[PDB]
Amino acid sequence: SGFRKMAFPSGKVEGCMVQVTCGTTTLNGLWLDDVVYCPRHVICTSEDMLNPNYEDLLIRKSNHNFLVQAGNVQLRVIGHSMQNCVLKLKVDTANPKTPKYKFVRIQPGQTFSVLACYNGSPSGVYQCAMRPNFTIKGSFLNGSCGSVGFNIDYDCVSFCYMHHMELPTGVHAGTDLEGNFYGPFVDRQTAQAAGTDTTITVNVLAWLYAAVINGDRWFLNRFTTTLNDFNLVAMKYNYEPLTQDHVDILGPLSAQTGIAVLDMCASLKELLQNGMNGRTILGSALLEDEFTPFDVVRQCSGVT
Amino acid sequence: SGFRKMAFPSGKVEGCMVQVTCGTTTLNGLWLDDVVYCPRHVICTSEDMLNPNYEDLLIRKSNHNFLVQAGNVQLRVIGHSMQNCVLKLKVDTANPKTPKYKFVRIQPGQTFSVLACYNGSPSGVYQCAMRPNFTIKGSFLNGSCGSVGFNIDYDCVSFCYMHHMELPTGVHAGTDLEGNFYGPFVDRQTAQAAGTDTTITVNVLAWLYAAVINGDRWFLNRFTTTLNDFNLVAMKYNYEPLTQDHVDILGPLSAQTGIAVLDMCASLKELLQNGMNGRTILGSALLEDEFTPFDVVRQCSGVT
Numbered sequence A, B: 001s002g003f004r005k006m007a008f009p010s011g012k013v014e015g016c017m018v019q020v021t022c023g024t025t026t027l028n029g030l031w032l033d034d035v036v037y038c039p040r041h042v043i044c045t046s047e048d049m050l051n052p053n054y055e056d057l058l059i060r061k062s063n064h065n066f067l068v069q070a071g072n073v074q075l076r077v078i079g080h081s082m083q084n085c086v087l088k089l090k091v092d093t094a095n096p097k098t099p100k101y102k103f104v105r106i107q108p109g110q111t112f113s114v115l116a117c118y119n120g121s122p123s124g125v126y127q128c129a130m131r132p133n134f135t136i137k138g139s140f141l142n143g144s145c146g147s148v149g150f151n152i153d154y155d156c157v158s159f160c161y162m163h164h165m166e167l168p169t170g171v172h173a174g175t176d177l178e179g180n181f182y183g184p185f186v187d188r189q190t191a192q193a194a195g196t197d198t199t200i201t202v203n204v205l206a207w208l209y210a211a212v213i214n215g216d217r218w219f220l221n222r223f224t225t226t227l228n229d230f231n232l233v234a235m236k237y238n239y240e241p242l243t244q245d246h247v248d249i250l251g252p253l254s255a256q257t258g259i260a261v262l263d264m265c266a267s268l269k270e271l272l273q274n275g276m277n278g279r280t281i282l283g284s285a286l287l288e289d290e291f292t293p294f295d296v297v298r299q300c301s302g303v304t
């Protein structure tokens, strides 16, 4: 029993982190096979970041300007290319610790682990969600760029995020491993404001299921609702609209607990309207929305 | 910027987890050098756990009854001994992945990472604190016993916890790696109730400092207090008494933010008396007490 915000074990990703230096900028790279992936802004001076022309900046860079270090050992760069907002540094050595891996572009509401790194060295691991506004709420200081987000399916690491940017509001923006930003964000030091950080309704419901499974049941009530009625209340509280697809996804947790999805919607409606009244659910005083249905089933069944 | 509940990277500990089977019980063991550490209750049947005599139960067990498997490969057990509530299984092979390590007994209020495992296989990593009542609030299903808690100091893993027990209230009890339970708990299926789960005041203050560092400042006020005045309020709210030792420990965060510890005590006093009024601090609606001062400095400075 018990229910924790739980990251994937980071060992397989730790084996992939290197240091990338270009001129005076040091950040992190991901070494898979004979390719090191890193943010293209590694080539920018402070001054460049106001209005960088990356193709023009890159012309001034040769292979030997990209210093790649795995631990204490230097890697030889034998090629470099820009794909969208990432650089792919070809090295002469395949990472011997390369796990089975995929590059995947996640949807808003999907969760992943981040291995925060500095100078190619892991500092910590935490669980994130791709927010509906395509930011993530991370922990990233200077030197943390190139840190990646991932899921593990048994032995296959699905890499979904590389860290690039902090917005003035202290939230985070980055790319998939093809170098495409999540959302409308750019690798430019410019006016970029995040949109409405809406709550991921299906994740809140999943987490209410996890609560019931783990003995926290005080918020169950005598009510039901409909998708349309619930969604009127979701709208008012900046919650994502709940779809039949979300209802279908919650089916296994419904079946396990014997609580109809719409009855749990009715619980959530009352929590939104009435607040927590100073009570907690799984040790939280707000409605947690960074557990997916799959996360709840995973943690509640003990998948490895 | 940003501040997350962050576990240590788990790679070094992943390399140490094995499966231990005795009769029909499967749980986890920690393989360091040529010793596998596991909970002695691996030898109990369900029936035994009501009033086990471990010395007597152990007489019926030989080396060949302890099945130890690292991945797909079996380890040969060449000796076994009971130390307090752990078994030490001597194996004929030193774990080649043994990191630098220490066994340390932590104090209440100290934090650590847990690598939740099932059948010797890592499922996830999360951050815990040794509660003032010597429980931890974990996530542990059947098969998770022998999962360990640890801190990392650069390259040296300090192992502080092995998981043994869930109390009827869904909280967790375990041992250090010398097999001594934290608190008054025993490896018996009996009436064991946790005492008052008091809030770790020095950790709350550390986390308020982390909030200010990261831009969350709405709770700073015009007030100060004294240790004695603050402690009257702490008593009423089941907070640990704040000592001059706690004040001294918070000195670096005081210096960095320019906020006197006692002024931050005054902030915390108002939060305790007035509540959050529906506001959040670092995305929480309650006062977080599972970040130590050292954790805040670590995360806010980017140590690896």
Ligand SMILES: *CC(=O)N1CCC(C(=O)Nc2ccccc2O)CC1
Pocket: A025, A026, A027, A045, A046, A047, A049, A140, A141, A142, A143, A144, A145, A146, A163, A164, A165
């Ligand atoms: C995220 C990361 O690790 N980065 C991106 C920022 C640079 C950096 O120092 N850039 C910078 C330029 C001009 C003003 C401020 C500022 O942080 C380091 C690597």
Ligand SMILES: *CC(=O)N1CCC(C(=O)Nc2ccccc2O)CC1
Pocket: B025, B026, B027, B045, B046, B047, B049, B140, B141, B142, B143, B144, B145, B146, B163, B164, B165
């Ligand atoms: C923590 C862990 O992984 N354990 C401890 C419990 C046993 C187990 O199955 N014991 C048990 C006996 C009788 C009734 C219930 C119950 O869980 C598995 C390993």
